[PDB]
Amino acid sequence: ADELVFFVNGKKVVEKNADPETTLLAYLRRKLGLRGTKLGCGEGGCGACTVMLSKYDRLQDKIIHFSANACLAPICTLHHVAVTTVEGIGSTKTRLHPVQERIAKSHGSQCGFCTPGIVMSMYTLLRNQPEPTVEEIEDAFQGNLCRCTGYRPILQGFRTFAPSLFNPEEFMPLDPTQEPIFPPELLRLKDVPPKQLRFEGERVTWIQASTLKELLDLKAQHPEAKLVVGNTEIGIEMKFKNQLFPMIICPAWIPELNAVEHGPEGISFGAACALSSVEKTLLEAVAKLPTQKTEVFRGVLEQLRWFAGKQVKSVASLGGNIITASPISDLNPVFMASGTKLTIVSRGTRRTVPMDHTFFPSYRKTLLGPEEILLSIEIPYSREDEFFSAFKQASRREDDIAKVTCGMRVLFQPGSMQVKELALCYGGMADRTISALKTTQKQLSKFWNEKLLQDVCAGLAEELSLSPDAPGGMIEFRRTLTLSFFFKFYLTVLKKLGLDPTYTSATLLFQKDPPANIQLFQEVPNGQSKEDTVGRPLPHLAAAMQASGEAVYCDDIPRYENELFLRLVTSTRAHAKIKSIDVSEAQKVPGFVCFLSADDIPGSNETGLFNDETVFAKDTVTCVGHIIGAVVADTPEHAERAAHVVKVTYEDLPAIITIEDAIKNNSFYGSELKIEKGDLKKGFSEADNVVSGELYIGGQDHFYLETHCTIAIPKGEEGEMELFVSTQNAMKTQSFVAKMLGVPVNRILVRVKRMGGGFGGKETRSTLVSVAVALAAYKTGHPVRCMLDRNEDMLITGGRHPFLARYKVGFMKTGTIVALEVDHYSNAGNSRDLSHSIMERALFHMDNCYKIPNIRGTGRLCKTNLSSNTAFRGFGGPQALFIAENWMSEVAVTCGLPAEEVRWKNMYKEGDLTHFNQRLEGFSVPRCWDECLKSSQYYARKSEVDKFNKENCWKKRGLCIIPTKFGISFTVPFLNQAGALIHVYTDGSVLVSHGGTEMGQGLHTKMVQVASKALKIPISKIYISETSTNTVPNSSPTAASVSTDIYGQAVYEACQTILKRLEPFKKKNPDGSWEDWVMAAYQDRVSLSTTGFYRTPNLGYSFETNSGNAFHYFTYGVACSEVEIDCLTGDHKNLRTDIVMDVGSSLNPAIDIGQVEGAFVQGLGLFTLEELHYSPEGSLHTRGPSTYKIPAFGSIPTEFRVSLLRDCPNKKAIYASKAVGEPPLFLGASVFFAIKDAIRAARAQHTNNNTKELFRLDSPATPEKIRNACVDKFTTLCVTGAKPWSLRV
Template identity: 55%
Template sequence: MTGAQEIPVMQPNSSQCFEIRDQEKVVSTAVGKPITHVSAIKQATGEAIYCDDIPTVAGELYLKLVFSSEAHAKIISVDASKALLVPGVEAFLSAADLDEERNKMGPIMKDEEIFSRDTVTSRACVIGAILATSENAARKGKDLVVVNYERLNPVIVTLEDAISHESYFPSYPRILKKGDVNNAFTNSSHIVEGQVRSGAQEHFYLETFSAYATRKEDELEIIASTQHPEDIAHMVSEALQIPSHKIIAKVKRIGGGFGGKESRPAILAVPVAIAAYKLKRAVRAVLDRDEDMQVSGYRHPCLIKYKVGFTEEGKITAAKFEIYANAGNSMDISCAMIERTLVHVDNCYFIPNVEVHGYLCKTNMPSNTAFRGFGAPKAMMAAETMIRHVATELNKSYEEIICINMYQEGSLTHYNQELTYCTLSRCWNECIESSNYWQRRIEVEEFNRHNRWKKKGITLVPTKYGISFQVNVLMQAGALLLVYKDGSVLLSIGGIEMGQGLFTKMIQVAATALEIDYTKIHISEMSTDKVPNSSPTAASISSDLYGMAVIEACNTLKARLEPFKAKNPNGKWDDWVIDAYVNRVSLSATGFYAAPEITYDSETNSGNLYEYFTYGVACSEVIIDCLTGDHQVLRTDIVMDVGESLNPAIDIGQVEGAFMQGYGYYTMEEMVFSPRGEALSRGPGAYKIPGFSDIPKVFNVSLLKGAPNPRAVYSSKAVGEPPLFLATSVFFAIKDAIRAARIDSGESPEFVLDAPATCARIRMACEDLITKQVTPTIKDTGKPWNVIA
């Protein structure tokens, strides 16, 4: 037991398995081929243009926002006189420049102010904006704006603070019920209770919030790093009281979004647009990294309490969940987030009787917002913790409990949607086989028997992710197709490119529909004067929606070309196009798609809420150092059902990227705050995100074969968000390793591990004589570790 085996150094290795269906390699059939991302070369060489790369123009001004230095306070006075004396500083904008009604904003509820007038409720509140001829002058001016406050109490930072003060948004808790939970508990053989806590996660996109606006006569053009340009234009329209047709919002690409740029960029883009319009000058702004991390909002910290009843065999009969999510100081889109949380607490398991209470906690933190997975990863983690708790209580393997309770074809969820084309069992069995799970489980146990201070863990985790905005009005998309005389095609859609490959996939869809080479098609940018009233590029559904709109536009144009094709059957695309032009046939077409209506009724808890589900299973093996708390991911195997992939290279990249982002969330990314609501972990020096060395040493990703999806474009499936939760396979493998260490120490194998599983938490969970000398422990303080007193 005290001897240690030599741990072999593993060489990084990986495999990517997918099927290319078009064996004939027809040039025009671009869908299903691993085509390179159309911007890849530009991005790799630095030629790709982002918002702040736009060349400066004469008379341009630079804007710096003045943020509140208090989390909860009354504004006594704002004095910008010293700032206006700085050479180069030309203006200061504040609430005094907008009347009360025009100063309101918010994506759903108008519960935010563009510029705070009387009070501030978090350090993300904007007091005003300094406009100067240079960034340095604007920075100096911003620091000279004097704001006097009267501090207000309480300052609510943590979920515990919110619960103790009963600080919840109106209309919450939101309650979802199915069956009779109390009766089922009465008749259950066993009942256990527990809780799961997960912290905030910073988006840490490479491009921080940025915006650029110019006024041309009485028109306004806005370029911003946002996933929802239409919403920015709408807010500016309301603030300036000018119609939307005189405002154009554009996005060529953004440097990562992950949901963080769906709604929050308005705090910068709207003031920039207002300044450009009022001063009749071009205005640009970029948040510094520390500013961005303080004000842009995070993944919602969450506390979930569960109570579960089950039979002697391990069949779950009932479950009750209480979900507390830290929404921050405004609603933003947290109401939509908690709805997804409520309907994903089942993860992959049939629970006949369910009761879920969802609380949105109102705190003096920056307004938390969308993040890849949008509420689901927190809920599904509770489900996985619960499953493993049941297994421990019955002294059975968690694999057995999962298989007993796993959804099958035709199962009903707790919101009564029937599962069709359910490939969970296939993904589960294929992952077990491809990862050689059972043999490796034996090897892990053997390793742990011979090593005291290094322990291995290995686990399997399944996932089921619903694809839909969950709101009918957002389930629509438009496209504009322009064909030129030389046969080249310019395509415009309402979605934006943030590295996820949406533009590439839409080019492939158009090429296949038009039956031409994909190199003839180009997408330049998203612009609200090309495709109006667009939904945000979010919820992993953009390929589904815009793909259908693109096909409709292509079919319209093909029908116009059909007579010329019939007249010249041996001709080519270019011949038919020029012939149509000569004969004065329109070579532009629009496409529009409205997804089938969501039939779910929350009053009766029935009907279909989602278009379909994306499934997957991951197996991860880790090794931990019981003396330092460090860990390493030795191997991860993923089997993902993405239907018939539009582009398997991009989809596998999305699976790998989502997994690594989830890995950061569950193991190392920890936001730390002061009791006054200040983010103390601002910047990469204080906030650790995964690096190259954190990638699993062996990383195998396989796309499930023969799993078409009739509910989406060309039988594909959404892929952006669903794989993120599979990173909990690492978290639970770490718990597996810690459990082995605790048994060696003579400690109880049962323990609570909050996410993220940082080095400190892993070390303290591996209880021994050393850890017992450390006081106070988290048990003694009762406070979350991420609040520094």
Template identity: 45%
Template sequence: MPLLPPIKRHQNSTNSSDSGHDSPNGQREKRLSEVDQFDAYDRQTLIFYVNGQRIVDESIDPRTTLANYLRDHLKLTGTKIGCNEGGCGACTVMISEIDPISQQIRHFSANSCLMPVCGVFGKAVTTVEGIRGVEERVHPVQERLTKAHGSQCGYCTPGFIMAMYTLLRNKPQPTKDDVDIAIQGNLCRCTGYRPILEAFYSFAKDEKGEIKVTENGCPMGEKCCKNGGDGCGGERKTLIKLSDMSKCVPYDPSHELIFPPELKLKNFHQQSFFHDSNGHKWYQPTDYSMLLALKRKHPHARVISGNSELAIELKFRFINLEMVINPRQVPELHEHHLTDDGDALNEFSKDLPESKTRVFKAVLEMLHWFAGRHVRNVASVAGNIATASPISDLNPIWMASKAKVVLDSEERGERTLTIDEKFFIGYRKTVIRPDEIVKAVIVPFSNENEHFYAYKLAQRREDDIAIVTGAFRAQMNPKTQLVDNLSISYGGMDIFTRLALKTAEKLAGKKWDKTLLDLGLNLISEEFTLKPDVPGGMARFRQTLTLSFFFKFFLQVAKNLQISIDHCVEKTEIGDTIPHTLNATQLYQEVSKDQPIHDPVGRPLEHVSGERHTTGEAIYTTDIEIAGCLHSALVLAPIACGTIDNVDPTKALEMDGVIAFFDASDLPTNERMGHHSDTPIFAKDRVSYHCQPIGIIVARDHETARRGANAVVVQCTAEKPIVTIEEARKADSWILDELQLHSQLNEGNDVVKKNDWSKYTRVIEGEVKMGGQEHFYFETHNCIVIPKEDRALEVIVSTQGINDVQTEIGKCLSIPRHKIVVKVKRIGGGFGGKETASPLIAVPCALAAMKLKKPVRLYLERFDDMAITGTRHPFNFNYKVALSEDNHLIDYDVTAYANGGHSLDLSTGVLTRAMVHIDNVYKFKNAHIYGRICRTNTASNTAFEDLEAHRECFCTETLMKQLAETYDLDVDELREKNLYNEGDMTPFGMHLRKCNIRRTWHECKEISQYLEKKGKVQEFNRKNHFRKRGLYMMPTKFGIGFGLKFMNQASALVLIYTDGTVLISHGGMEMGQGLHTKILQIAARCLDIPIELIHVEETATDKVPNSMPTAASVGSDLCGVAVEDACQQLNQRLQPYKDKMKEKAWKDWIQAAHIDRVSLSASGFGIIHNEPVDFFNGKGAELFGYCVYGTACCEVEIDCLTGDHRSNWKALLYRATVCSQWRRSGVREWDPFIKGALVCTKFRQPYDVPRDYHVSLLKGSSNPHGATCE
């Protein structure tokens, strides 16, 4: 059923679906007996098409999703699975069918992870592989996304491709609005969406109906250097388009794959389908009477459409589902009619008077924010009503508008009910009887004196469940301006959607004025109260939203009635529109005109795997097929803290397909892993955190393994856990002793003197708290372990640190490391979450493979991944700071408390990184910095991209703001006055060289036109009472390198073959940052050959041993220097041949060297010079090789009534970190937008991207320590 529901008048109905009620009992009973018989259905074999190929399957389990079928059965691994909940869009495919009403071919996008494979019976499925591959010419969508640098890790890319492809199949010349809606359900963790939008907007027509790609504007406007101005810093910079689409192939719909003729000629859309596999039954009737008969005979069978609820229950609650009814092919449920008492919420709304369609428009507007496009394409309003979610977006509208539902059953016939306070009777319970079908929804017309509005607030605007929803209807007397009738309904304020009956009753007959407003607010606050421990939390906020929504409604009605209220009446619809013009720029320094054309350094190269990302041909660990591979799943602890009394795998081992169970007793020696050997591989006697692994189940397939793991009985005695930093401090629960830093010790003092705060007149103190943050790499943790001869293992794993995986497997299974080969081709995002957490997955998988002597795969579902692995460290900071009379920072005392989780992991590195960055970019005359790691009963928290550096900057920026507010100072002037200067020493003892912070500050201020924008923001805030804007400019620095000296090293292997091609292996992991692309550039310049001759092989421990994790923003530096070293060795060997054979070319020199028995392979090595800090005694050192600096400016707008907000404008100015590839580095800087938003809310979507966004790299600031081959 489509989401725009069947809304139909049923009185005096004469359609065939009603005739069954007048049938003789004998015919009815005969139909009941036939509904389960094979011959009652046209087809019993699943038939559909995939990429033009006919698929026939007689035995597939109906519980199988389309995504799993595509990947596991058809080996079409371009379709990715990111969440298995329909929330990320990585699994998006296009489904084509013949509409049962119009008989026209319809293309729609869908989440294949939710769609049951039986649901595509008689349909055609198109995946990313089916729209053209690399061997042929790529599809225009694939080409443009590649050229726009729209993929980084690439795991989300196929989903975006298919979403846009589906739009073009339906509308070859879309608008930008169409593009935005098409990708509503797609997420990207890497890019920040700008390059994706740029690529897709190039297909959109402008207001004149023309498709034209225009250059993006400079943030300096008329002051741009290209116009003769000096607004770009007074130095030669070139403003280029982010990508040039003018040379791309135009889209031609005539070249697309046709709809399979068989499906149309044989009328598959009119054929009923029944499938039974191992007791799991799928019914897909095409006749309405058969649907009623099915529901009568099987009243508790689940009726599905979008499957968004049932799929979750099957996947994560392991319900036993024996039968499903899919009514999508029943024509009567697709009909819509316009009558005197109802409408279909479609194009009719455009032709009717505005006064009659106010309810319809509220529904349509709410539908825009309802889920994502891929969910809406297959979902149904009937299903949403029957599911009775307490946070439903639509149910408050139905209740407030007094909409009706028509329920039908074969036994009792039709009945029509109003959706009112009697309809929802409990949590996810309605008055709908088990044998009834929701046949229709009747939505009433509004009238001229009726005002209707609906509101929703979620943690993000699109594709998110609501925090609170509200719908309001006011029927006014046009003569007296009194309220004739009022309806108020809220979702998210009880276990079901509720009407504010008491409030509506007492406000009836009142005049629409401030008295009514005050009374209404009081009544609502009394009628809707929540306990502090209410499920979903945010009790006070939710209660406030009910008042805010009512207030918004009051203002809007007052505006409609032209009633003057002592408040600024603003636009109060659900979410404000934003300009679709993407004004995004990157400023960079062009390469020298003398640079050889084949020298790629500094040029904007596409991602080396970009095209393979867009075609679905990029292979990740989850895509690799191993013959005879078994699957496994971890058995997880049901409590957070306590003792394990018994673990019984008997029920699991009795299940068909389950092969074995292993736990701590099966480990040969070491039961713990980690850098400090304090992390149990399996919990044995005690549980330290909820969902801690207890054992591992091995089975023939992934789903059987998961069901088997769920069947293992784990009995525990629970104890009270320690969860928060506050609880740990109170319980004196610590990991390690206190760490410290004292700037005095770096100045020749041997004794630390405590601050005498009494001598200062300007002192403030405070506390900053910051919670954890999920990494949300799109590819979850997974690995494959393949046993080899002589107890050797081959491990293919998604990790940032192959050395750690190799070390931990060898240590825990007593296997020498030279017999363990760990490999990584690419990973679908890491962000620090795959640095040390990977052994948690790899070691149990290796144990199972070694025990069974068969390949074993372990793949974590998103839920399990988030439960088992740690997050970013929650932090608390307590600070005290003194400011001099001339506004210089003097003394600074700060203590950082980090929630380390149940074991140490990387908490020491995270805390010390926090301690050395807590100064941010400001010079403190004296600083005492302390740190403690709290032990709690949570998953061990770990690295997160910048290792907490910028969170500590937030602490210092908070105190800077507090100082400014306390002493009435301009915070920007205070910042600027205290910025570091060249040669200054930090509290951790490092002298700052090439310190560009003041340059980035001043240039960002100029590029952003900060002072001008500040005046506009102040003017906006004066004019608007309930919407406010804020403008902020913030500087930052980041030290490049690991804190431990021995980790700042890397190796590489460079091989030259006699045909002149070059193969490189290095110790870094490609995870979307473009590392391999940068390595290619470095090697091409060093060897002075075209980049096409060079290939980077997968990262493997048998090529490069003892490699460090790819982390700390140092992968390009270390691996680049190592590759440069190897290339220079080869250059030295080849130089005699170059001198002797000057007229010859590269290949000739290689062959000559080979004939002379000169080695054409070299192992390179590179380091970053640094010295370690003594954190136990507080003495600093030159900890980093260098620092990078940047300044950002951002304008944010907020709705003061609800907290809804958006970023309007952003500018970032960075010092270049690696000169080899500005393009990838520059694009990557959009990631802070996503990362920063994740701290306080949910994963951002394309809609949330600032449409005015500018990134610049500071001219003349190339990294002198990196690999440049100069």
């Protein structure tokens, strides 16, 4: 094998044993020790693994820089390429690059797991364009995800490259002259003639062909050889599709596969040309050539806009997408409809043929022969009287799989409207790209008119049929899109041939609007010391290190020379008996160490919050993903492969998947929960109107950028074990590990530095991985670790609880509520976990901010064969609040009154009691309400929304303003306790330790701010290193948004103890320094170490007597959002959001606004974009960012404004502040109801005339539900055009 030679951050790397299967990410992290680059999904979607690649382009005779996903880039494609990671551009040890500095100072980093990847995308842009426009900056992140920030801070800080939270004036100017030089050695190796290289790995042989002749010989010589260019498809096949290609040929170097020729018929691109090049070349052609000649080009470009991100487009080859021939390819429909020419060659043979319906004979296949390879693709110039359109619709605009995508071309007779040629090619309607030949054939010689339109739609409705079990589901939506797409095409061609003003917008291609961001908060007292940072926008203390990639996350911790890897073995059945396990083939995998099961457990196999779970499945599995055992091996790949071949024999059992199956089978956990106040009977009797209905709200995957991870170190003495875990509950991790091992708790030490996101997903379910790794450590005596891949995490760890509600509300014509009844049902999963408390918080919030005199709420936990669901930011509150706002919205419509009016009149007032009889003191919703109305200019915009709806037939705008209140405190009284430990060393430096953990919310930053203020010393003298069970024991999980409140108090008390001890010395030496008082105290033998403790007073609610305080106080807020839906596709824009939040006297406005935006965006995702799909048998389909869509940079409100309520000190918490972690999440629902408002405008447009109609809209309001709800001539036709002999009169 030849040597693989490339560079990393200027340093030359010579790999003599390069394995074709090794990815750059694995190499950087496990071989080069550069852990700044992270694993977030492994499938090109999160961008957390983003790096920059540089190389001398021989054909261009220039050095080119471009981003790329390390997780998908085979190091074998990098021969003579220069890699640049986040560590190569700057660090806190040296100097931060402007990119790293700005994202950190702008509060663009919270948990920080995504920061390096985002930094590299921005950096790569700057290396291509030193002074980019706002648009270029925004597009640089099509392929980067962030779960914590809400994206606003990141974009606002980065736009600077084109009181306040930050000051751009302090930002260091970008200076290209000071950027790292291209490796001088590589520039010399360019004069050297390229040579064929060969790399040999454990299972794969890789051949880097240098010439076309070589490639053709290789293909002839080895027909089975798999070609690879960008590997963005093959990596997925090998990684997720369990594929193995013994031989691989990379033709990336060949000149012919990279040439770009401008001919008379069109533009020719070599098959290896990256999509970013095709996109750049085509954009150029469109700018210079007549519009009439670039119809197809513009079609290609429109698809490329929403085609993955910069990372993928920079390596993804044109030929690769074509040959992969996926049914939902966005390019093939366009190439087919246009007759794009393909030059196919083999040793000897050669031919150029237009692409047509026959090029794809079957699923993921093409007409190419085994020895043939796609040489080039020529995209045609459009001719006169020839028009083209390309459309795509998915769940999210950015980087997503098309539900339906297409290419549409029409050629008329010279200067006429008479069809000579018509091609409608679709993706997402078959197991391949298809052309509706039967439909279009009937229109040849016909004229472009209404009749043709009706005919085509009827034709499509009948020819493009979908069985009810069609892969991808969403049958109705898809068929509707095929017709809506043609309609858009029909109108666009009419326009082009030259149209009602109210139809015009339907022909417009997506146009992003100019962003606008404003944050408002209160300045601190004029006489406040510069060293007292309480109330100031101090950046997250680890933000600079997060931006540089120096911040250490669990897997970044180096491995011991003898550290092994664990891979969980899980059930592939929702409910079945385990008849036997066969590890015979696993034992054959190199590096196999052992297979662990329940019988290996020395202590107890009974785990879980309520001891209703197994550590390892025993005789029976109760959900797909149920952990049966685990394989330990010498490397991650080896453990994965062995685990994959472990054969489990099951015997299925009756399963209960859905909430419906549960209710009918009486499958519940415990008994019914209920809160009832007043007289329902007398309530409904006094009601003028009564609305009854059913409402559903889907689940949610936390999607913390850092998945579950645990490192367990077995000491070998007295059962001692030290674990490094990504968890919010060091206490339970410790007790559960000990219970499993069967040793005292004092033997187990759990350490938590930070989490790349938790969101409740790491409050209990982190133990599923921890206890298993601990067992492996115990059994092997070796240290063991395991970080979950995204698909494992999504499948096993549980998520937010899906809710089903059955409500009945009674109200007067005035809109006043007089009676309410709601039965909540949650899908809890295969164990109790936190389901019961979640239902409780749900019931505590079924009132939101409205006084309902007669009320009854109930809840039931559905016992099902699904991974156990757990805590998720909101903890049941969001579901209950959503249900409440749903019936409130129906009340407004029914009474024919303005929603804001109905909400306001029903709203609580100072001193009122909730349904659970707790007095509302300091009820600030009215203030947030009025300021939000005013600052958002609600009324004025209200009239402008109506106007827009009158001038637009296929696009509507909606506007909604909703309030929220969130009870602060664990509803389990004993959890409201916090401890802290403080040490003042002799140099005067302080080390603070407390029970809370850091997950990006800035808990430590705030604790240092507090300690600094309490002790009256600069924050520079204080430090918080980690959370550990041997410093602060019996800690509650970091949750319920009360960490700042309670640890703040514990830290405060410990500080007070310190001050009392130093007082004597302060009096003896008044002009002395803190250092002098500390040293004198030490000399005098006075202890400089103390614990601190807080216990939230007066808490204890009973559901039995409906009495006692349930919360310490409530955090309030109001959000007003406006949207614009596309009645024909389901897509929509979040035009503007205005938020007013009451967080009392913020301890840190920067972090608190960050929390508001982050929560808001997470709620936005819950109510409008995120959806998990399960097979009827209970098997999750959506196991990655590719199919599960969380908010992207482009998903946030274009105009995003946040204000923290002024002068609202909360005497109930540390320094008059308020919890902010979860309270704002529900406000994201404002976007949901704005959308429903827009949908009602659409229905009143094409559906019916019942101004008081009450159509059901469940969450999430995805493009599917939005489009399906916009009933029109097309949706209708998709049913009737898909009858009975007789029909009763």
